[PDB]
């Protein structure tokens, strides 16, 4: 996947897939849906499914929630309060163990991020009255920092892959909806049907 600050964005349309098989699996660590009950995903359906995928730290899964604090929750990704979707997180320590130093996270920014804002930029952050130019020194910091994903780290430091799903309540003709079940057929019987 992509970086935590530059989260991967995917749009899904014109497909029919089951959502019950997701939570039924024995591999999902955290599965919290806010806009709808987890067991009623198959019953209902929406439009304009959006998927956000990234990797965060082990002890920061609680930051991804409507109306919370945190440096990552304010300078890397912030969920709007009026959010109708679900969040899935699972362990991926063996995928990044030696160990991983290609990950960067944002820590310094002038203001909090806007909802669903893809703020990608680089600049020497200023923390002093005097102007900053040339090379980084005092009050001149690099907003991105690396992860110490050492393989010998227990809970709280292992990388977790997080996928956030969002949907819209039918602003257009329906394109994606849950699969339906078809039974058998009979003959020479007084039968009512919908077909």
């Amino acid at each position: 996947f992509a970086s935590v600050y530059a989260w991967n964005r995917k749009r899904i349309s014109n497909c029919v897939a089951d959502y019950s098989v997701l939570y039924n699996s024995a591999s999902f660590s955290t599965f919290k849906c806010y806009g709808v009950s987890p067991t009623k995903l198959n019953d209902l359906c929406f439009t304009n499914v959006y998927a956000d995928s990234f990797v965060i730290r082990g002890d920061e899964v609680r930051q991804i929630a409507p109306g919370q604090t945190g440096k990552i929750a304010d300078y890397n990704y912030k969920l709007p309060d009026d959010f109708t979707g679900c969040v899935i997180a699972w362990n991926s320590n063996n995928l990044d163990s030696k160990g991983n130093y290609n990950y960067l996270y944002r820590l310094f920014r002038k203001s909090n991020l806007k909802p669903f804002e893809r703020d990608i930029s680089t600049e020497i952050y200023q923390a002093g009255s005097t102007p900053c130019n040339g090379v980084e020194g005092f009050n001149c910091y690099f907003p991105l920092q690396s992860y110490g994903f050492q393989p010998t780290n227990g809970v709280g430091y292992q990388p977790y892959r997080v996928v956030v799903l969002s949907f819209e309540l039918l602003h257009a003709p329906a394109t994606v909806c849950g699969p339906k079940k078809s039974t058998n057929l009979v003959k020479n019987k007084c039968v009512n049907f919908n077909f």
Partner: antibody, heavy 120, light 108 residues
Framework: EVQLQQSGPELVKPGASVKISCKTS????????IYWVKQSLGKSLEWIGG????????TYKQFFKGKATLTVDKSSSTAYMELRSLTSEDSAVYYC?????????????WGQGTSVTVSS | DIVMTQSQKFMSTSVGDRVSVTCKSS??????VAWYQQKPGQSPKALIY???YRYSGVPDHFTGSGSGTDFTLTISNVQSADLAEYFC?????????FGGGTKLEIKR
């Protein structure tokens, strides 16, 4: 509601070590840098130094070797300053100040200062 | 290099005459300075900021100056609480350097 307090005057021996603490109240410690200056008996103010409250990064000037170490602690929400090798002329008053980044740059508030005197 | 004198060592004004002082700079460094007020004995106090600005914490009847490689500052008037020490600021390079100031006396 921001206030700064310091200790009283102290006397030091030639070539000894002393400690001075700068206490700040009324605001959270780890967002604004803390600066120090020296006034040597009605002389030009000399920038002693400054350090970050959260990053704990401290930087100095070329004409500062002689006390080159700063630290800040969150347990007492204060800053520590120490002197060594008080040879002949470092008997002065030291002012602890704080600057504001969102508004009102350049070290608005100061402190009453701690006066150090070197003598036998 | 780094040298500063702001054109005087001490100023004297008797009564009523407007008081002013420059904060001249060396070879090109930029335009961002500040001034400090120092009554004899207590903590310092900022006088002016960026050579054109106003302090909400001061009874502002004040005037600054322009920009360039030179500076200037003007104060309100000669009241009964103006005799003190003046200093201005130079913060472009990290080794901030101050000047000797200029000390004003009410020329009785």
């Amino acid at each position: 509601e921001v206030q700064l307090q310091q200790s009283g005057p102290e006397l030091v021996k030639p070539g000894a070590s002393v400690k001075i603490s700068c206490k700040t109240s009324g605001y959270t410690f780890t967002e604004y840098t803390i600066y120090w200056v020296k006034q040597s008996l009605g002389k030009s103010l000399e920038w002693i130094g400054g350090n970050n409250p959260n990053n704990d990064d401290t930087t100095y000037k070329q004409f500062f070797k002689g006390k080159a170490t700063l630290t800040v602690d969150k347990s007492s929400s204060t800053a520590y300053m120490e002197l060594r090798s008080l040879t002949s002329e470092d008997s002065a008053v030291y002012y602890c100040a704080r600057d504001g980044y969102p508004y009102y740059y350049a070290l608005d508030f100061w402190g009453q200062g701690t006066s150090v005197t070197v003598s036998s | 290099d780094i040298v500063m004198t702001q054109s005087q060592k001490f100023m004297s004004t008797s009564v009523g005459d407007r008081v002013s002082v420059t904060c001249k700079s060396s070879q090109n460094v930029g335009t961002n300075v500040a001034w400090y007020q120092q009554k004899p004995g207590q903590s310092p106090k900022a006088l002016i900021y960026s050579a054109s600005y106003r302090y909400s914490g001061v009874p502002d009847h004040f005037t600054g100056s322009g920009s360039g490689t030179d500076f200037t500052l003007t104060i309100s008037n000669v009241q009964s609480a103006d005799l003190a020490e003046y200093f201005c600021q130079q913060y472009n390079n990290y080794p901030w350097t101050f000047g000797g100031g200029t000390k004003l006396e009410i020329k009785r």
